[PDB]
C-alpha cells in the first residue's frame, strides 16, 4: 500500500539566435509543481511552504549557486557547440532530470536531454550516453562532455545523493498536501447528436474512472483528456448513441476521494 | 571560481601552538567544502581536516584529532586551522583546498574531490 | 519537426448566468515552446488573464494552462485565440456552453 | 606511456646535501627528455634542470648553477638530482617530468612541454 | 634540390584487418622502407641515418612505432564515431625541403584517394571541398595538443635537420653522375611509307635529361618524348620517337644532353 | 575513385641474344592499390621476379616497378600481365625488342 511521487526537474532552453536566449525551469513532485525558475530571476522560486524539504538554508543556498552557475554555463556551452558543430539557429533544448524514492527507501534517477523535441543523449551512471540512432554530431558532443570530470562528478552527486535526500524531505514536509483527497463534483449536459456528455471536475489526485445502464456499462464511452484546473484539481469529460437507448443510461464515477460512495447521475 | 592563499606558517617549538589561515576569493565561499592538506618531508600529501556547513561535524585525520581544530569565518571568506600540541611529525607544507559539493554527500566521500588548491605554507616544528 | 497545438476550452464550474466562474484554455502538444495565447470576450482580449508555468510532457511536447475570472451572461461569447509557428493564422476556439 | 615516481625527499640542514631519484616505467626511457621541477610554498612551479641524450649539456636554472647536478642511468630507468649546498630557499616539492622530443629541437624550447609528471617529493631545508 | 618525402599507405579491410606501410624519399632516392611486418623503420642505405646519433635515431623509431599503432587505433575509432563503412584507405604525404635561409614543410592526408585535411601551422585544417563529417574529425584532432606539438617539431625541426645530415652522409651517392647509353631501333610504321625512328636512352642518373631527334642544328619539332621510367639500379630510361617520311630518314640524328656528359652530347645517326 | 594502370615494358640494356639483361615492367597511375603483376616467358610465369616498394605520386595514384634478370634468345617471348579492378580482363603487354 503505497504510491510513488517522482521528482521531475524540467528545463526549457530556447535559442532564437546567438544573441537571444532564455532558460526556464520547473520542479514537479508527483503532479504538484513545487518550484519555478524564470530566466529573469536570480534564484529558483519556491511555490509551496514545504518546497525546501528538510534542507537547511545553507544547503539550499548551495543548490542556488550550483544552478545559477549551471544556467549561465549551459547557455555558453550550447552557443559554442552550435559553432563547433555548425548547427543552425534556432535551437530548442530540454532537460528532464530527477529521481524517485520507492517505499522501502530504494532510489533511482534519470537525466534525459532533448534537441528540437527529440532525445539526443542522457546521463547514465557516471558518463553521458547518446540516444540510439542519434545524429552524427551527438557523438562529438558526447566526446567533449565526458572529458569534463568536474561536471560528471557533480551530476552524479546530484542524481544519486542530492535528489533522493531532497525527495525524502519533501515527502515528509508535504505529506499532507501530497496525500490530500478532494472530492469531484459532476453534472450532465446535452451535446450535438452524432450524444450524452458527463462532466467531472474538481478531483485530486489525478487517477479517476468514468464510464457510462444499471450494471451494464456501455463500452462505447468516449473519455476525453484529464484537463487541469487552476486550483491544482482536474477535469474530465465523457461522452456517449442510439436516441431510444439513451433513456435509462447513467454515468458512474470512481475516485479515491469518494471512499466507496460512487457518484451516480441518471439522465432525466 | 575560487582562489586560495594560505598564510601563517612559520617556525614553532614542539608542544607550541600556531594558527594557519586561508583567504578565499570567490562568489559563494560559504557553500564550498574547505579542506586542509599537508605534505611532510619524504611523505605523501595527506588530508588533515575538512569542514562544510554550520552544524555538521568537521572531518579530522586520526593523527590530528584532539590537537587541531578547523573553522571558517564565512563573513571574511577565510578558513582557519588552529594547531595545538605541535609535534615534530607535524612539520609539513600545509595546503588549502576547496570544492563545491551539493547537499546529501557525506564529507568523507569528497576528500579526494578537491578542485581548487592554494600554493601552501611551511610549518616547521623544532626540537 | 514541429507540432501544432491542441486547444481545449472549459469552465471550472458549471455555467450559471450571474454566478462567478473561471474560464480555462488548455493548450498542449505543441513544439517549439514559443506561443501566443489570448482569452477573448466578444472578440476582444481580456486584460486580467493568468497562466501556469510552461511545462512539457514525457514526449517533450509543451502544454500551458490559461485561465481568467469571469461571470457569464446569456449573450456573452468567450473564445481562446492561439498563435504558433505551425499556424498560418491565429486559431480561435470558442467556448461552447453546456 | 611513462609513469614517474620520485623518492629521496626529507629534512636536511642548511648547507647539507641530498640526492633525489625518479623511477620511470616505460618502453624507451633513454629517448625521453627528463626534467626536474620544484614548487616552493606560496610560489609557482618552476624548472630546475633538464637532461636528454648522452653528450648534450644539461640545462640548469640560474638559481641552481654550481650547486645542483642532474644525471640519468638509462640502464636502470632512473633520473637523479644531486643537491649540494642546500639553502632554505630550496625548500620545495620537487617533481619528475618527461617528454618524448624528436631530434632537432633545442632543449631550452621544450621545458614548458613536459607531459608525464610524478606526484612529487618534498625537501625542506631547515635553519 | 633534394626534398624529403615521407609516404604512408594504411589499408583497413574491416575492423579486424589492417596494415600500414611506409617509405622515405630524399630527392629521387628511396632512403627508408617501413613494412607492417617490421618493428622498426628499415634503412636502405648505409647512410640512411644521416648525422643522427644512435640515441637520436632510436627516439625516432619509438615515435614512429607508437604513431603506427595509435594511428591504426584512432582511425578505427573515427570510423565508429563517424559511421564510416569499411574498407578504408588512407595515405599520408609529409616532409620538408631546405632551401639554401627559408624552409617549408607539408603534411597532407588523403582518404579513399582524395585530400581531406592537412597540417597548417599548429593545427589540422580540412580541404576546401571535404565531406561534412571531416569537420567532426578535425574538431577531435585539434583537441590533441601533444600530437600537434610533436608534428610541428617533426616538420619544422626534425625534418630540416634530417635532410642536412642526409646530404652530408650520402653526399657521394646523392651527387653521383652516371652516363647514359643510347641505341637506335625501328618501330611500327606511322602510316603509308612513313618510318618511326626510335631512340633509346637508358642508365642515366640523375633524372633530368634532354633527348630530341635533330637534323644538324635543327631540332625536329615532331619528336615524341616518352615518360622517364625507372631501372632497378636507380637509373632511368627514356624513349624518343619521330614519325618521318622514309626519304627524310637521312642525315637525321638523335642527340642526348645529360649532366653526366659534361657537355659531350651523345649523337647517333640513322643508318 | 578508380584509376586504370598504365603498363610499360622495357629492358635495362639493348636486347642482345645470349647476353644477360633485366626486363622491367612499370605499372603506374592506378587506384586502388591492390594490383597483380606477373612477368611471363613464353606464356609461363617467371619465378624470380622482384618489385620495388609500393609508392604513390603527388596525385595519390600508385606506381610499381617489377623486374627480373633474363637472357633473351631469338624465339623467346616476354610479356607483363597485369590485373586490376579497373580491367575486365588481364592486360598482357608484350616486350617489343625493336
Ligand atoms: C538535480 C536536481 C536537484 C534538486 C533540484 C531542486 C530545484 C529544481 C528546480 C528547477 C530545475 C530546473 C532544471 C534543472 C536541470 C538539471 C540541472 C543540472 C545541473 C548540473 C550542474 C553541473 C555543474 C555545472 O554547472 N557545470 C557547468 C560549468 O562547468 P565548469 O565551469 O566546471 O566548466 C565549464 C567549461 N567546460 C568547457 C564545460 C569545461 C557546465 O558547463 C555545464 C554543462 C552542461 C551539462 C549538460 C549538457 C547536456 C547537453 C547539452 C546539449 C549539447 C549539444 C547542443 C547542441 C546545440
Ligand atoms: C617525418 C620526420 C622526419 C623523420 C622521418 C624518418 C623516415 C621515416 C620513414 C617513413 C615514414 C613514412 C610515414 C610517415 C608519416 C608521418 C609520421 C608522423 C608521426 C607523427 C607522430 C605524432 C605523435 C603520435 O604518435 N601521435 C599518436 C599518439 O598520440 P597519443 O598516444 O597521445 O594518443 C592520442 C589519443 N587522442 C584521443 C587522439 C588524444 C596519435 O594517436 C596519432 C595521431 C594521428 C596524426 C595524423 C592524423 C591524420 C588524419 C587521420 C585520419 C582522420 C580521418 C579518419 C577517417 C576514418
Ligand atoms: C534574435 O532573435 C530575437 C528574438 O527572436 C530577435 O528580436 C532579434 O532581432 C534576433 N537577432 C538577429 C541578429 O537576428
Ligand atoms: C535570460 O537571462 C540572460 C542572463 O541574465 C540574459 O542574457 C538574456 O537576455 C535573458 N533572456 C531574455 C531576456 O529573453
Ligand atoms: C576482413 O578482411 C580480411 C582481409 O581481407 C578478410 O580475411 C575477412 O574475411 C574480412 N571479414 C572479417 C569479418 O574479418
Ligand atoms: C600489421 O601489424 C599490426 C601490428 O603488429 C597487426 O596487428 C596487423 O595484423 C598487421 N597486418 C597484417 C598482418 O596484415
Chains B and A touch (3+ CB pairs under 8 A): yes
Calculate ∠ Cα A93-A98-A103, nearest 5°.
155
- What is d(CA D79, CA D88) in angstroms, rounded to the nearest whole number? 24
Closest CA to A109 of A44, A166, A159: A159
* A74 neighbors A91 (Cβ within 8 angstroms): no
Calculate ∠ Cα B6-B9-B13, nearest 5°.
160
- What is d(CA A34, CA A49) in angstroms, rounded to the nearest whole number? 9
Task: Give Cβ neighbours of residue A261 (< 8 Å, ≥ 6 apart).
Answer: none
Residue of B nearest to A59 (CA): B103
DSSP-derived 3-state class of residue E136: helix
Q: What number of helices (H) and strands (E) belong to chain D?
A: 0, 11
Calculate ∠ Cα A221-A227-A230, nearest 5°.
150
Within chain E, strands assigned E span 4-14, 17-26, 29-34, 42-43, 88-98, 103-111, 114-120, 123-126, 181-186, 194-204, 210-215, 218-219, 224-225, 229-230, 236-245, 253-257, 266-269
Partners of residue B42 in chain D, C-beta under 8 Å:
8-11, 121-122
* B64 neighbors B48 (Cβ within 8 angstroms): yes
Point out the residue among E113, E114, E186 whose CB comes nearest to the CB of F98.
Answer: E186
- What is d(CA B18, CA B6) in angstroms, rounded to the nearest whole number? 13
- What is d(CA B11, CA A261) in angstroms, rounded to the nearest whole number? 83
Closest CA to A126 of A96, A148, A99: A148
- C-beta atoms of A65 and B113 within 8 A: no
CA F85 / ligand 1 centre spacing (Å)? 53
Determine phi and psi for E75, rounding to 5 degrees.
-65, -45
- What is d(CA A124, CA A122) in angstroms, rounded to the nearest whole number? 6
How far is Cα of residue D100 from the mean position of the Cα atoms in its chain?
16
Burial of F72 (0-12, 13-18, 19+ CB in 10 A): buried
β-partners of residue A101 are A107
DSSP-derived 3-state class of residue C96: coil
Closest CA to A174 of A24, A67, A10, A31: A31
- What is d(CA A40, CA A254) in angstroms, rounded to the nearest whole number? 43
The conformation of residue E35, written as its DSSP 8-state character, comes to -
Point out the residue among B40, B44, B120 whose CB comes nearest to the CB of D41.
Answer: B120
DSSP-derived 3-state class of residue F20: coil
Residues in chain E whose beta carbon is closer than 8 A to a beta carbon of chain F?
7, 9, 11, 21, 23, 25, 30, 33, 89, 91, 93, 110, 112-115, 181, 183, 185-187, 198, 200, 202-203, 227, 229-233, 237, 239
Closest CA to B93 of B23, B7, B17: B7
β-partners of residue E153 are none
Within C4-77, strands assigned E span 6-11, 21-30, 36-41, 44-45, 50-51, 55-56, 62-70
β-partners of residue A46 are A35
Compute how many other C-beta atoms are within 10 angstroms of the C-beta atom of residue C5.
22
* A250 neighbors A213 (Cβ within 8 angstroms): yes
Q: How far apart are the first and last CA of chain D?
A: 40
Chains D and E touch (3+ CB pairs under 8 A): yes
- What is d(CA A261, CA A254) in angstroms, rounded to the nearest whole number? 8
* E133 at interface of A, judged by CB pairs closer than 8 A: yes
* D16 neighbors D28 (Cβ within 8 angstroms): no
Output the CA–CA distances (angstroms, integers) from residue D7 to A185, D58, D72, in the order listed: 81, 21, 14
Task: Give Cβ neighbours of residue C46 (< 8 Å, ≥ 6 apart).
Answer: C38, C39, C40, C68, C70
The conformation of residue F74, written as its DSSP 8-state character, comes to S
Looking from the CA of B111 toward its CB, the CA atoms found within 13 Å total 18
* F60 neighbors F31 (Cβ within 8 angstroms): yes
Any idea where the domains of chain E sit in the sequence? 1-175, 176-271
Determine phi and psi for D44, rounding to 5 degrees.
-75, 150
- What is d(CA D32, CA D18) in angstroms, rounded to the nearest whole number? 24
- What is d(CA B44, CA D13) in angstroms, rounded to the nearest whole number? 21
Determine phi and psi for C25, rounding to 5 degrees.
-125, 115
Q: Find the radius of gyration of the CA atoms of chain B.
A: 14
The string of DSSP codes covering A132-147 is: TT--HHHHHHHHHHTT
Task: Give Cβ neighbours of residue A171 (< 8 Å, ≥ 6 apart).
Answer: A5, A101, A178
Burial track A48-76 (b if 16+ CB lie within 10 A, e otherwise) = eebbbbebeebbbbbbebbbbebbeebbe
Pairing of strands E236-245, E229-230: antiparallel
CA A163 / ligand 4 centre spacing (Å)? 27
- C-beta atoms of D105 and E53 within 8 A: no
The conformation of residue E3, written as its DSSP 8-state character, comes to -
| Nearest ligand to the CA atom of E26 | 2
Give the resolution to one decimal, in Å.
Answer: 2.3
Output the CA–CA distances (angstroms, integers) from residue B4 to A61, A151, B1, B33, in the order listed: 21, 21, 10, 13
* E57 neighbors E169 (Cβ within 8 angstroms): no
Task: Give Cβ neighbours of residue E266 (< 8 Å, ≥ 6 apart).
Answer: E180, E182, E201, E254, E255, E256, E258
Q: Domain holding D15: CATH number?
A: 2.60.40.10
DSSP-derived 3-state class of residue F28: strand
β-partners of residue E195 are E244
Domains of chain C plus CATH, in order, are 1-98 (2.60.40.10)
Within F12-51, strands assigned E span 21-30, 36-41, 44-45, 50-51
- What is d(CA E239, CA F98) in angstroms, rounded to the nearest whole number? 12
- What is d(CA B43, CA B92) in angstroms, rounded to the nearest whole number? 9
The string of DSSP codes covering E66-79 is: HHHHHHHHHHHHHH
Closest CA to E111 of E94, E99, E127, E95: E127
* A222 neighbors A238 (Cβ within 8 angstroms): yes
Ligand 3 neighbourhood includes A89 CB (under 6 angstroms): no
CA dihedral F70, F75, F80, F81 (to 10 degrees): -130
Within D1-127, strands assigned E span 3-7, 11-13, 18-25, 32-39, 46-51, 59-60, 68-73, 78-83, 92-100, 116-117, 121-126
Method of determination is X-ray
- Contacts of A190-196 with C-beta under 8 Å, sequence gap 24+, read A190/C98, A191/A239, A191/C98, A193/A243, A194/A241, A195/A239, A195/A240, A195/A241, A196/A239, A196/A240, A196/A241, A196/A246, A196/A249, A196/A251, A196/A267
Closest CA to D103 of E63, A205, E109, E140: E63
Output the CA–CA distances (angstroms, integers) from residue A263 to A209, A254, E181, in the order listed: 11, 7, 116
- What is d(CA C20, CA C13) in angstroms, rounded to the nearest whole number? 9
Amino acid at each position: 500500500m503505497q504510491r510513488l511521487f517522482p521528482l521531475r526537474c524540467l528545463q526549457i532552453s530556447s535559442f532564437a539566435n546567438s544573441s537571444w536566449t532564455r532558460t526556464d525551469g520547473l520542479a514537479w513532485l508527483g503532479e504538484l509543481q513545487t518550484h519555478s525558475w524564470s530566466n529573469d530571476s536570480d534564484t529558483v522560486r519556491s511555490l509551496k511552504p514545504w518546497s525546501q524539504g528538510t534542507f537547511s538554508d545553507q544547503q539550499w543556498e548551495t543548490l542556488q549557486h550550483i544552478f545559477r552557475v549551471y544556467r549561465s554555463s549551459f547557455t555558453r556551452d550550447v552557443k559554442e557547440f552550435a559553432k563547433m558543430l555548425r548547427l543552425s539557429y534556432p535551437l530548442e533544448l530540454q532537460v528532464s532530470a530527477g529521481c524517485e524514492v520507492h517505499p522501502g527507501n530504494a532510489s533511482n534517477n534519470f537525466f534525459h536531454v532533448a534537441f528540437q523535441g527529440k532525445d539526443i543523449l542522457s546521463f547514465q551512471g557516471t558518463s553521458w550516453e547518446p540516444t540510439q540512432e542519434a545524429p552524427l554530431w551527438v557523438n562529438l558532443a558526447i566526446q567533449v562532455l565526458n572529458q569534463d570530470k568536474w561536471t560528471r562528478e557533480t551530476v552524479q552527486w546530484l542524481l544519486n545523493g542530492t535528489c533522493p535526500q531532497f525527495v525524502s524531505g519533501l515527502l515528509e514536509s508535504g505529506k499532507s498536501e501530497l496525500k490530500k483527497q478532494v472530492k469531484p463534483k459532476a453534472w450532465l449536459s446535452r451535446g450535438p447528436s452524432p450524444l450524452l456528455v458527463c462532466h467531472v471536475s474538481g478531483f485530486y489526485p489525478k487517477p479517476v474512472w468514468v464510464k457510462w445502464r444499471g450494471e451494464q456499462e456501455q463500452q462505447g464511452t468516449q473519455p476525453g483528456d484529464i484537463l487541469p484546473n487552476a486550483d491544482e484539481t482536474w477535469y474530465l469529460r465523457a461522452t456517449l448513441v442510439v436516441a431510444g437507448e439513451a433513456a435509462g443510461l447513467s454515468c458512474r464515477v470512481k475516485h479515491s476521494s469518494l471512499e466507496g460512495q460512487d457518484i451516480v447521475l441518471y439522465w432525466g | 571560481q575560487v582562489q586560495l592563499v594560505e598564510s601563517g606558517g612559520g617556525l614553532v617549538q614542539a608542544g607550541g601552538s600556531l594558527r594557519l589561515s586561508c583567504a578565499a576569493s570567490g562568489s559563494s565561499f560559504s557553500s564550498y567544502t574547505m579542506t586542509w592538506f599537508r605534505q611532510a618531508p619524504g611523505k605523501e600529501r595527506e588530508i588533515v581536516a575538512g569542514i562544510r556547513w554550520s552544524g555538521e561535524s568537521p572531518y579530522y585525520a586520526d593523527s590530528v584529532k584532539g590537537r587541531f581544530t578547523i573553522s571558517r569565518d564565512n563573513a571574511k571568506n577565510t578558513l582557519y586551522l588552529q594547531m595545538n600540541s605541535l609535534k615534530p611529525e607535524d612539520t609539513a607544507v600545509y595546503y588549502c583546498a576547496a570544492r563545491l559539493v551539493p547537499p546529501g554527500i557525506p564529507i568523507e566521500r569528497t576528500l579526494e574531490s578537491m578542485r581548487y588548491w592554494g600554493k601552501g605554507t611551511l610549518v616547521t616544528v623544532s626540537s | 519537426i514541429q507540432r501544432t497545438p491542441k486547444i481545449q476550452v472549459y469552465s471550472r464550474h458549471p455555467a450559471e448566468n450571474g454566478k462567478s466562474n473561471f474560464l480555462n484554455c488548455y493548450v498542449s502538444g505543441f513544439h517549439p515552446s514559443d506561443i501566443e495565447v489570448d482569452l477573448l470576450k466578444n472578440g476582444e482580449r481580456i486584460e486580467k488573464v493568468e497562466h501556469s508555468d510552461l511545462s512539457f510532457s514525457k514526449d517533450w511536447s509543451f502544454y500551458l494552462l490559461y485561465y481568467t475570472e469571469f461571470t457569464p451572461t446569456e449573450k456573452d461569447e468567450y473564445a481562446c485565440r492561439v498563435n504558433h509557428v505551425t499556424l498560418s493564422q491565429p486559431k480561435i476556439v470558442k467556448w461552447d456552453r453546456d
